[PDB]
Amino acid sequence: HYAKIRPWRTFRLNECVCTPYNADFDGDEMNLHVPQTEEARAEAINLMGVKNNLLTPKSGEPIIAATQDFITGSYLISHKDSFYDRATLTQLLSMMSDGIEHFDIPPPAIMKPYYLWTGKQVFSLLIKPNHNSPVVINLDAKNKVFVPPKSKSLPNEMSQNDGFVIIRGSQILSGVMDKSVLGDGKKHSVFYTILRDYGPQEAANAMNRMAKLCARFLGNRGFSIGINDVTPADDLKQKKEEL
């Protein structure tokens, strides 16, 4: 994949393409070869590049996808209560797609009792931002933490914690994304659907778009592990010895 000339003397690249290398930025160094003739340079990028090899051969699952700070920033925008104003939304959509992008803002989730967009409408502009962007993908996907609903209701999405992803026309109607909707190792994902339908270029373009948002907003919001979340709250401490 293509070169770029930068400051301090170390190789540096993305984190979505980090799982086939089995890299972990530990101190592990990697070597880099250049082509010298046109005949091998024009085939090193065409059938051996990154954007064509988004899958694995052994299963047919997307092998370059979400990483650690990629779905934990994607989960905190969608927990049914991240409600954004105009001024926060324009800053999110600006930090998402740094340079050239038009956005043609949708109507908000709630009207006159103060105008507050949801997080799914912030996230659905990452898939189809323009009116000219042809990404009209749609799918129906589970997640890992799925508790079943009340067993009398009909659909598979009336459950307790966000349930079941329903995308209908590049708009998310229910559910957090949460690992195998964009999560490295199963099918029926978002970036598998864009790659399967609308080429590899739009799939690599909409996946560069997620990394900027999850790099700026996850540090802008704040997220930590303390000591008060590893302690039992005296009922486990009362019950564990007697059990």
């Binding site: 293509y2 070169a3 930068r6 400051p7 003397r9 690249l13 082509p35 003739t37």
Partner: protein, 48 residues
């Protein structure tokens, strides 16, 4: 996109032979020097 530093690229060099689209670019680049980064190190002649 991988991002290589500005010193590996001074010692990693690609043979770009000159033909009518390279000529106006590989002439401003050959006066630039091996030290300044948009430049060149060697030059092989027509007679080799």
């Amino acid at each position: 996109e991988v991002a290589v530093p500005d010193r590996v690229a001074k010692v990693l060099t690609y043979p770009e032979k000159v033909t009518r689209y390279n000529r106006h670019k590989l002439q401003e680049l050959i006066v630039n020097g091996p030290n300044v980064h948009p430049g060149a190190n060697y030059l092989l002649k027509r007679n080799e």
